[PDB]
Amino acid sequence: MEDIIVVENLVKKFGDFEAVKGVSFSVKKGEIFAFLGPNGAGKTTTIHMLTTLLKPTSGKAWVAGHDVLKEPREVRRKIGIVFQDQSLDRELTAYENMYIHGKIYGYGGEKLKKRILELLEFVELLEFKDKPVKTFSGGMARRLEIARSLIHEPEVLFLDEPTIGLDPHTRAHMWEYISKMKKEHNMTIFLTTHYMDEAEQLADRVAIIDHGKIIALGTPTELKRMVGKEIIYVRCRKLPDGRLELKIEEITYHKPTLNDVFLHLTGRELREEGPEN
């Protein structure tokens, strides 16, 4: 019921270029909220502003009862950050990297040691506790960032494209951690993604973002209601690539997905490999 994220006309300009054009939304406590959009939509810029790493041009943002602009240190203490810019030390082991982060936030003793091992067990890295992070996979390093961000018991976890670059097994396990954090620990998760399957499967609500704007917002089912119950693509709404969204070149038929909602709103798709290029 309580709003743990409140954003009002959040804007970011890089010189004269508008990256984020005044986005607004709210996230309830214990919710998985996803920003779904393609590369270049303003997802990383938005998540950097919500986590205090980038100053907004204008607008307002409140995270966990605190003003992001006026109380960034109080906001940093209440949130977890897992971004593509890895801040792990390759020379230190997995356990050592998390002891460093734990002592920085004020934890210590046998209790900090137990917590680290528990969080390493939760992300399935307990067997690699005494192993250098230089010899770690991308998947392993991202699983270690999830465990590290949880040491200081944040209320909200911010994930910038959590499963980009990961194999299906690590990706499936990443979704289980997120799901378990929500359901078993009342955690709030704000994530950015261009994966329609990741947004449908995990998110309670989705904000579809395109060229710095929210172009649709609601539950995956409310968004899917904007398109038919059964869609056809043949090569009524004509698309730039030539096919028609309802003895030929290409015919496709399936149940609607959030990629079909993106095609319906913008005339193109979320993926890079799609016919748009």
Ligand X SMILES: Nc1ncnc2c1ncn2[C@@H]1O[C@H](COP(=O)(O)OP(=O)(O)O)[C@@H](O)[C@H]1O
Residues 200-219 that bind Cl ion (CB under 5 A): 210-211
Kindly write out the interface string for residues 242-271 of this chain, putting x where it contacts a second copy by CB under 8 A and - elsewhere: -------xxxxxxx---x--------x--x
Q: What is the DSSP string of 106-141?
A: T--HHHHHHHHHHHHHHTT-GGGTTSBGGG--HHHH
Residues that bind ligand X (CB under 6 A): 14, 17, 19, 37, 39-45, 135-139, 167
Contacting a second copy (CB under 8 A), which of 21, 28, 171, 213? 171
Check residue 269 for interaction with Cl ion (CB under 5 A).
no
Could you tell me where the beta strands, DSSP code E, fall in 15-98?
17-28, 32-36, 58-63, 66-67, 79-82
Q: Measured between alpha carbons, how far is 118 from 116 in angstroms, rounded to an integer?
A: 5
Residues 33-52 that bind a second copy (CB under 8 A): 38-40, 44
Asked if residue 43 belongs to a known ligand binding site, the reply is yes
Q: How far is the CB of 126 from ligand X (least distance, A)?
A: 16
Asked if residue 192 belongs to a known ligand binding site, the reply is no
Check residue 14 for interaction with a second copy (CB under 8 A).
yes
What's 218-267 look like in SS3?
Answer: ECHHHHHCCCCCCEEEECCEECCCCCEECCCCCEEEECCCHHHHHHHHHC
Check residue 196 for interaction with a second copy (CB under 8 A).
yes
The annotated binding site for ADP is made up of 14, 40-45, 134-135, 137
